[PDB]
Ligand binder design. Structure first.
Ligand SMILES: CC(=O)NCCCCNc1ncnc2c1ncn2[C@@H]1O[C@H](CN(CCCNC(=O)Nc2ccc(C(C)(C)C)cc2)C(C)C)[C@@H](O)[C@H]1O
Length: 331
């Protein structure tokens, strides 16, 4: 029983891999996970990168010499820390590049069958990363991913931001079950790298349920990939969003209200009356399964829109303007 071992840079339990090195799917195997782990820990620790400076991934001797060189380097770094040199971070967030590796790693050891996840740590990572950069979140924010799958988007945001809490709600059995493993693996691997994450919870359930009505209402930042949602589900969501607090934000792949929404007495009930909607900057060179560049939509709860409309009704000048417009429009 041959093995390959990688020591943790912060003294956690070693990562152990059986030889021959397992294959996860067509584009991921343990060999490259080992190589990627080594070189990301080198990015973590400059002295390590400085010492390390990796040939045949199908030779045991070649791979073992790679792991040995890494582990011996780690030992020297730990001795270096016992001296006058200050130890590593231990409370920092992972860089975007490292976080991508970690999530991929977590996915590799959680989802043993990527084939029964038949939908439509994927390469939405960069999309979500762009949103994390643009949508500012603080420690008073509550984050929710509506329909969170195996939970990778929640994990990514939780690793990146300092929201008070992050939630993922998932309805189906299989992804919710995998999410339990994703959760356990994530906490383990983040510790292995010595990286911090904000609080998060991956739950089972339906976000249309009566329980989630109040929960949505109290959420300050919602991510929902709703592009392929039918009109009934989207309508139900609009009803939920209507109870959100001022300044509450919804980021989605399909708008919940029109961008050029003009309020009148025919659309007084519509969600557009209480939110600003903008199309966010797309990420250069993206493209989705439809072959089009990905666009995102930011909704911000703002009830001054409605307030100002009601004020305008009290103004006789504005009133004539509105009423003359309506009659002209009906043509
Ligand atoms: C056709 C259809 O889906 N109808 C829905 C039925 C209504 C029931 N409501 C639901 N309640 C709870 N969970 C349900 C219900 N609907 C379905 N899910 C689950 O969503 C999961 C899929 N998710 C994605 C999972 C991973 N998370 C993400 O990709 N998140 C994410 C969010 C936002 C973005 C951007 C930044 C682009 C806006 C990007 C990614 C959907 C929403 C695309 C599946 O596992 C579904 O089981």
């Amino acid at each position: 029983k041959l093995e390959l071992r990688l020591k943790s840079p912060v003294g956690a339990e070693p990562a152990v891999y059986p030889w021959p090195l397992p294959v996860y799917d067509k584009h991921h195997d343990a060999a490259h996970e080992i190589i990627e782990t080594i070189r990301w820990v080198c990015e973590e620790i400059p002295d390590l990168k400085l010492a390390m400076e990796d040939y045949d991934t199908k030779s045991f001797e070649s791979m073992q010499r790679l792991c040995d060189k890494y582990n011996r380097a780690i030992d020297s770094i730990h001795q270096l820390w016992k001296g006058t040199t200050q130890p590593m971070k231990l409370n920092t967030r992972p860089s975007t590049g490292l976080l991508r590796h970690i999530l991929q790693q977590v996915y590799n050891h959680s989802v043993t069958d990527p084939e029964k996840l038949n939908n439509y740590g994927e390469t939405s990572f960069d999309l979500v990363a762009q949103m994390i950069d643009e949508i500012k979140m603080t420690d008073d924010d509550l984050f929710v991913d509506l329909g969170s799958g195996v939970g990778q988007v929640v994990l990514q945001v939780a690793a990146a931001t300092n929201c008070k809490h992050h939630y993922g709600v998932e309805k189906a059995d299989i992804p919710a079950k995998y999410a339990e493993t994703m959760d356990r693996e994530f906490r383990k691997w983040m510790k292995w790298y010595g990286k911090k994450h904000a609080e998060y919870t991956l739950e089972r359930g339906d976000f249309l349920s009566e329980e989630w009505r109040e929960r949505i209402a109290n959420t300050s930042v919602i991510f929902v990939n709703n592009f392929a949602f039918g009109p009934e589900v989207d309508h139900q969501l609009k009803e939920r969003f209507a109870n959100m607090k001022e300044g509450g934000r919804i980021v989605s792949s399909k708008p919940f209200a029109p961008l050029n929404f003009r309020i009148n007495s025919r659309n007084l009930s519509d969600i557009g009356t209480i939110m600003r909607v903008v199309e966010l900057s797309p990420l250069k060179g993206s493209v989705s399964w439809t072959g089009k560049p990905v666009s995102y939509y930011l909704h911000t709860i703002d009830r001054t829109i409605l307030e100002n409309y009601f004020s305008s009704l009290k103004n006789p000048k504005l009133r004539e303007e509105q009423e003359a417009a309506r009659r002209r429009q009906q043509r």
